[PDB]
Amino acid sequence: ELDQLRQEAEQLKNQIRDARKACADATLSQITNNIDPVGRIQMRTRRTLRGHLAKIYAMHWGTDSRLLVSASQDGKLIIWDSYTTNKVHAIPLRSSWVMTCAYAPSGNYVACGGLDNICSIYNLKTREGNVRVSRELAGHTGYLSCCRFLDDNQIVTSSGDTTCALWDIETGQQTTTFTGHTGDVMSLSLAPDTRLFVSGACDASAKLWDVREGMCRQTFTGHESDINAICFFPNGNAFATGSDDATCRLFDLRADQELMTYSHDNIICGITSVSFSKSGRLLLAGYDDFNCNVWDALKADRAGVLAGHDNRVSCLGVTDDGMAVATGSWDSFLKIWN
Amino acid sequence: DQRNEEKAQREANKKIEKQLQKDKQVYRATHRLLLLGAGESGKNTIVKQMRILHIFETKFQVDKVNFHMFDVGAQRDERRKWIQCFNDVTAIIFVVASSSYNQTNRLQAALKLFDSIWNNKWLRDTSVILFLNKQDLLAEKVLAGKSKIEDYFPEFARYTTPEDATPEPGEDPRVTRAKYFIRDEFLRISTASGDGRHYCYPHFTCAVDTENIRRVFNDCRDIIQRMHLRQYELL
């Protein structure tokens, strides 16, 4: 019964592929040829935030677009002030291998997760100012790769457990488990409406989950290697992925396939972090060749380069007004660009 | 007024930067070690003896030097990704069960994972301390001769023991052959790529061997020394 059910699976997959080709009546390379290019984007390093002791693996902006959190392999979760380049809190973590960190959109909490298979929640808006553990969200059987704070005491955590999860912090138990990925789930990105989120895994596939229902609303294939970063389009009807394939792909939730491929023949390095500009026309991408590329989201052209990192660029982040770009890297330096 | 609040930010940042210096003095003093291995490779006993005799996390201290060993446990078997976390790691401790059978070529599986570690472009400067574990069960296995490596490695029969052999008392030539033959199967990968950046330090250990904490400490000193000697291009 297995071979016949595999045959059923392959013919239904072929049906989905033919329905995608039937939806493929044109491309962006043909419709956007009449779309003017963005020119040469020559962005320069505005501020240099130094102080981390190891590779900076994660970074996330506060809702004020002023404060960042940066997580580094040394065991630190530092809160920065980008306007006053000042450290507000230096949160030591129980597990040095912190692979992710999040700043709550309410500003109240900050998360961090890694190889301990635990997402640790620290309370920023505490009565004494001492950022202390609120919860330790255990339950994943794999390393915690990316956690994004949902608004109402919920947190969307992605693990190497091949399973995402939506945790209720007040209780400490996950209310939903998002399953279907066969590889290590590497990165998350909450949609602007924070009702759907997207997951990248080492199966080169991305899954659009309904956090309210718990189903994979959509599975996007097309990348060729491990999805290292994912980020939503500003309108929440598309998302961009970066992988070790050394290419960025732009999937559309409606077109149900790739829109553009952001690759260059002289680029052989994996893409570790992805972000967007306010218009979504500029695609911020961190690379292994130690520099970030600002791709033309409508032409797959390298509109610019954010170079100046002495090692692999691990985390990107755009200010809530889009006024700056923070780039943490394995060189332990978080640089602000504009 | 905003000057006063900005000066309060400066004072809190000053305290925090003092604390971060005080914490970096501890960070760059402890050595990070990634401990890899196959299924029931005997590495758990090595953890226990390195723990008590002075994922899971182990902080020990030998000769006043701090080491942190990170036994990746409760993790999947797809070591592709979290191993990128281990570049600042001074040494990737590779444990091979030399007598894993008496299941299915665990030695060739370790050879291929070892090759994939060296050719990994992020581990192209992280050295690998290689623990060929279970050298005692391989002793009785090959001297018994009922379960051979020749059926798994025909060039073992065509392999002659090197002149650098130092057999322990009781190590018959039939065992010091397989002992040094496997070691050169790994050195065939350790020398055919990435010279001068990273180095393999193969060792022969067992559950009863206790100075494994000094063999790793001596070769992590060797790793740091070679990293400095290549910072000045003296090596």
């Epitope: 080492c202 080169a204 290697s225 394939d245 | 999947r76 090759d115």
Partner: nanobody
Framework: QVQLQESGGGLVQPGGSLRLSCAAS????????MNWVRQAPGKGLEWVSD????????SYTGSVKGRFTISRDNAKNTLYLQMNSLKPEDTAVYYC?????????????????????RGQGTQVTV
Amino acid sequence: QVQLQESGGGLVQPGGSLRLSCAASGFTFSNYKMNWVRQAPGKGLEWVSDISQSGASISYTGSVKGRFTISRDNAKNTLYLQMNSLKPEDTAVYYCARCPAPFTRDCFDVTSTTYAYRGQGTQVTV
């Protein structure tokens, strides 16, 4: 879609010869290192033989050296394994696998229990 379909297996008498064809589709074959792994009955996934993108560096498992031979057609996206002078231990489901990253000599986790870019396997009974 990383697609790895395989053909050419089946039943053969001990001592025969077989050639397994790995028709890859969905990823540019010349970009990434390819190899064969096999899962004999007895719960063991073992790597068999490497071949680089260009086909210059070829290794073999000891138990299959001199008797197994691999080729690659980067144009047709196919990998072959001619299995000459078979032994009763050679009964196994052979998976045609490629390591995750292109332009890398490193080959991680092709032999993992639930690897993603590993073929569907063909059973070769001796």
